[PDB]
Design a binder for this molecule. Structure first.
Ligand code: CU
Ligand code: ZN
Ligand code: ZN
Lengths: 153, 153
C-alpha cells in the first residue's frame, strides 16, 4: 500500500497530524487525523499546489488545480483536485478528520505527495458563495496551519 | 517535476533554505541554498527515506537507499541515494550549499520529493570511519535540522 503523513504547523495554537493511505494506484485515499486549536465550526481543508514553506503557508500558492477547473466541493462535478471540503472542530477545538476521497492520488500526475495540506480559518462554501472568490478559494479565509505532505512508512 | 524546495528547521538553532532544480528527467539535480546556526566545520547532508516529522527528525527514518547498499560519499559507487556527502560552514556558522548530484532525482524511482533532507551534527566519514555506524550513517551525529522536500514553483 501507499501511506503519507502531514505535520500541520502554524503560527498560532493550530497544529495537527494528518495521515493518508492508498492501497492501490487508482484506489481512494483515506484522510484521517486530529487537529487542535481550531474555532468550533467548519474549517477549510485543501491541498495546495506547492510544498513551499519559505514564506509560511502563503508560499504554498493556490489550491491544487492541474485540470484548470473552478473551486467546488469534494463530491461536486466542478472542483479542484486538492479540494477536500470542510473539517469540523468540536467544542474543545479538536477536529478528528475522517475523509475518503477518490479524486486525490498518492502516485501519478495528480499525486499530492510533495505539496502542502492547509487547514483554513473559516468555512468553505464549496463554490456556492456566488462570488469570484468562491470559485477560487471557497471563502475559506486565511491559512491557520500548513505542512508538506510526505511519504510515510 | 523540475523544481523542489526544503525548509530546514529543528529544536535547536540550525535553520536554512535548500532549493533543487532538475531540468532533465535523467539529469543531475542542482542542490543550492544556505544554512545557518551550525558549528564551523563539516556537517552531514543526507536525504532520508520518510518525510515524517511527527516525532521530529527521528521519524524521518534511515538514509534513502532503494538499491540496498552501504553508506559512502556522493562520488562513490557504494552509497545510498540520499548520500550527498558533507557541507562546510564558515566561522560564523553559515553553510552555503552547492551540490550537483546525479544519483538523486526529482522524479522517478530515485525521487526525493516527499522525503526529507536532514543536516547532522558531526562530519560524515563517507563510509571510511572505521566502525559499524560508518557503513550506516557515516558517524554524522545527531539530526540538527530537517524538513520535507516539497514541490516548488
Ligand atoms: Cu544522515
Ligand atoms: Zn479549491
Ligand atoms: Zn548513507
Amino acid at each position: 500500500a501507499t501511506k503519507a503523513v502531514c505535520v500541520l504547523k502554524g503560527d498560532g495554537p493550530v497544529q495537527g497530524i494528518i495521515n493518508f493511505e492508498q492501497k492501490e494506484s487508482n484506489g481512494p485515499v483515506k484522510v484521517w487525523g486530529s487537529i487542535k486549536g481550531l474555532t468550533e465550526g467548519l474549517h477549510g481543508f485543501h491541498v495546495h499546489e506547492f510544498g513551499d514553506n519559505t514564506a509560511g503557508c502563503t508560499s504554498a500558492g493556490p489550491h491544487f488545480n492541474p485540470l484548470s477547473r473552478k473551486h467546488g466541493g469534494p463530491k461536486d462535478e466542478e472542483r479542484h483536485v486538492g479540494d477536500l471540503g470542510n473539517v469540523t472542530a468540536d467544542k474543545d477545538g479538536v477536529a478528528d478528520v475522517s475523509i475518503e476521497d477518490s479524486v486525490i492520488s498518492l502516485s501519478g500526475d495528480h499525486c499530492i505527495i510533495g505539496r502542502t495540506l492547509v487547514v483554513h480559518e473559516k468555512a468553505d462554501d464549496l463554490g456556492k458563495g456566488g462570488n469570484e472568490e468562491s470559485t477560487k478559494t471557497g471563502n475559506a479565509g486565511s491559512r491557520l496551519a500548513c505542512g508538506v505532505i510526505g511519504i510515510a512508512q
